[PDB]
Symmetry: D2
Subunit: 231 residues, 4 copies
Amino acid sequence: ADTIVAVELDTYPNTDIGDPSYPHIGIDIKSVRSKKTAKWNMQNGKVGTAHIIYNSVGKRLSAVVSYPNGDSATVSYDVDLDNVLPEWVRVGLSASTGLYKETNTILSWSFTSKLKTNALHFVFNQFSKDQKDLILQGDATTGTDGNLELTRVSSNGSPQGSSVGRALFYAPVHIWESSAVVASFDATFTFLIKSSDSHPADGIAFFISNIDSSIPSGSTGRLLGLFPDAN
Amino acid sequence: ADTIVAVELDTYPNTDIGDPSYPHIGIDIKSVRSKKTAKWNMQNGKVGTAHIIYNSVGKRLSAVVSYPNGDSATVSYDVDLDNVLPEWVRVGLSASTGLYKETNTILSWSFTSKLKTNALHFVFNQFSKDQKDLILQGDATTGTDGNLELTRVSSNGSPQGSSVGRALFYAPVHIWESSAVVASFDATFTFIKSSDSHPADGIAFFISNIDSSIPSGSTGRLLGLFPDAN
Amino acid sequence: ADTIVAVELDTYPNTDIGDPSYPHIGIDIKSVRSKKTAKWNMQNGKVGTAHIIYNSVGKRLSAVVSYPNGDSATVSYDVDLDNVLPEWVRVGLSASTGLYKETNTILSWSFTSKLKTNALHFVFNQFSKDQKDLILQGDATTGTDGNLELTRVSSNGSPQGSSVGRALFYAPVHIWESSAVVASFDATFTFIKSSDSHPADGIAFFISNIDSSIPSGSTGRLLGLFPDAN
Amino acid sequence: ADTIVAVELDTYPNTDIGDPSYPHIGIDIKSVRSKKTAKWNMQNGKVGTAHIIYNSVGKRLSAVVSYPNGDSATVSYDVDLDNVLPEWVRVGLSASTGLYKETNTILSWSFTSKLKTNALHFVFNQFSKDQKDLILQGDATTGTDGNLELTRVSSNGSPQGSSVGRALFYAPVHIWESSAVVASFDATFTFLIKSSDSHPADGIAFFISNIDSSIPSGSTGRLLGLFPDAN
Ligand SMILES: [Ca+2]
Ligand SMILES: [Ca+2]
Ligand SMILES: [Ca+2]
Ligand SMILES: [Ca+2]
Ligand SMILES: [Mn+2]
Ligand SMILES: [Mn+2]
Ligand SMILES: [Mn+2]
Ligand SMILES: [Mn+2]
């Protein structure tokens, strides 16, 4: 199976697989069952911002998710990613819907990684229809509204259920290197999760994977396009 | 054929393809025959730095190549690259040798492109043996001395003739987009030693169509960039 | 007198100091009479973006001013700023009003200078009421709407006439150094509304000696930059 | 008194004021008695590198000090700097000598702070004789060898004792802002501590202070130019 490190913006409590009984943000290290979560007020139809930060010195993977009204949720997890991630990775965004659905629209995404310097930095503040530096997987699509639709949206604009999709940056990322004194990464994305369902589901994740990571089969819904099972 | 924009550090004067009669830096737009050149003193065995600068505003592709002693050569060419390059490109380093040879060692390479924002920036100040975010073409190799040898160097450290190689950054780059108010790029690389009577053939920073490959027969004076000298 | 290099967004044509007979962007080198101008459609009440670009390599000071609808004006001037500016400078925004007026509201300002490295980069996408890393001169104020009002605006939001103000970045900037292979700077700011029959007088990004102050009598057409129109 | 947050590269054990009984790196929050230290092998005459990292999300001030042979020491301290530092600060480097001495030469210094964006980033890879964007205090001098000599060095090159000096970046830095979701800073400097003394002393610190911070009187030696006393 792939190796996954992720920050999940989990809109739907799957309390049967360890989700807290509210929407939450989580840090996922090789499991959809987050090593740490925080209660998250997802604001339907509002543009949220997620920032993810890690460095090899503090060894603390952190994320904050905020909306324009000031509300935010933060979660941090002490982890030495040198010991979890392959040296080379791809980085991406994933999202899913299941029985319940939502738009999992990404409006921007930036990422920086540095080994201290080697560095990779990309920023998408607009996505093209033919976003050649993105590898789209599953239902993920770009263009023509400048956004990245991680999961299926019909032409009328309504999200679809049982959808999973991801967008990986095209280039592999050298995420750690033994000679490096510091290896840091940061990611920011903005998103717009909207649903008229009974409940929104399932969420968006920023993830770091093996370079050849693919959507595991059956990873819609609770599995967020990141894992083959809920273990 | 590929579409190439390149800044060449041309160590070897090939005067019947229109090179000046001295080593030179050149701006190449879709031709190995540089639109503009400047005399360049390649300092054998010294680490050089090339800086290449463009923006969609001043529409001036500029390059400076310098050495630590301060000597430098600069060339600039007014060109609207929106009218030469595909929107999407790959960026790379190329080098070649021919009858005469030189090491074509890249010690570092950075690149930034911004559309104003979408942006891509990378920097390699050390290359790895398996540099997964580089597409190596031809004779180019990395590692583990931290360098990118664009052209073949044997075990004894002697550069080989009729070698060509390139290194492209893995990801396509969105180098211009018509609504961009500013589409700027910059590249810097550090790098050439030869015990030949003359070093050749040079190194280029280049920007190419995404699927660019070394043109057949582009060793020597063609710098791995062009299928011919037209 | 101060030494000024400026990019002016000149909303008001003062044709007997050599302005063109339309609103324009201009590159000013030690004179309010721009060395180069381009016709500029200031879009009343819309947020504009100015980008200013220079490097010691192409030696071309360029500016583009644009609006969200895509309209834009660009001006470029070939100049070796090593020969005009002191090595150390302050960088700023200036604006003025005269008989006619406009808000001269800065919504953001970034600046990068690099000597290739020594570097300074700042960005303000929000200004604070007490913006300690800005030196405000004349009528310029910040806060707490997140903006920098270079010129006086009364409570009712009406801009006042014969207002001049500037905002300099607190730290001196080492804008060139003779050994620098590349001394580049860039600045971007976003910003103008008037119910006057004509907006005036404009906004400038400028680079000045470190101790630069508003010249006496530099409201109106002098843009807070120059003691006279010579 | 000033408010000081600092990362100290403490070359001299003052075990009578809480120093561990070896050279160490430390995180100093309003006291010279470090809240956390790590044993540090200062390599006489070698060029070391210090990286300091903090962000308002993880709230962990971290530092690593490394030398070209690979040896490094790291120290991290969980602290919410919002609650310690004034909103506006100056950032600097300080060093001292006492009864024992060393060069406290800085060869480069970079700093970045961001509020998420407002940002300040400066880099000095060479210091000029007239480094106008540095406020030099005490014995600190620049030019003409491209370095910043935090403490006194005689013309023959030997460091002097009972020396204290600092270099602050000229502009105040907006280090936190209540509206910011993230406020991060990073600092890197390289240094060359060399001594032919019986023991080197006293060390170098990167520090963040109130904007009007000055060398406290009598802050040579153990106090590293940062504090008025050893409390
Ligand atoms: Ca869930
Ligand atoms: Ca040639
Ligand atoms: Ca005018
Ligand atoms: Ca001590
Ligand atoms: Mn979950
Ligand atoms: Mn040539
Ligand atoms: Mn004018
Ligand atoms: Mn100590």
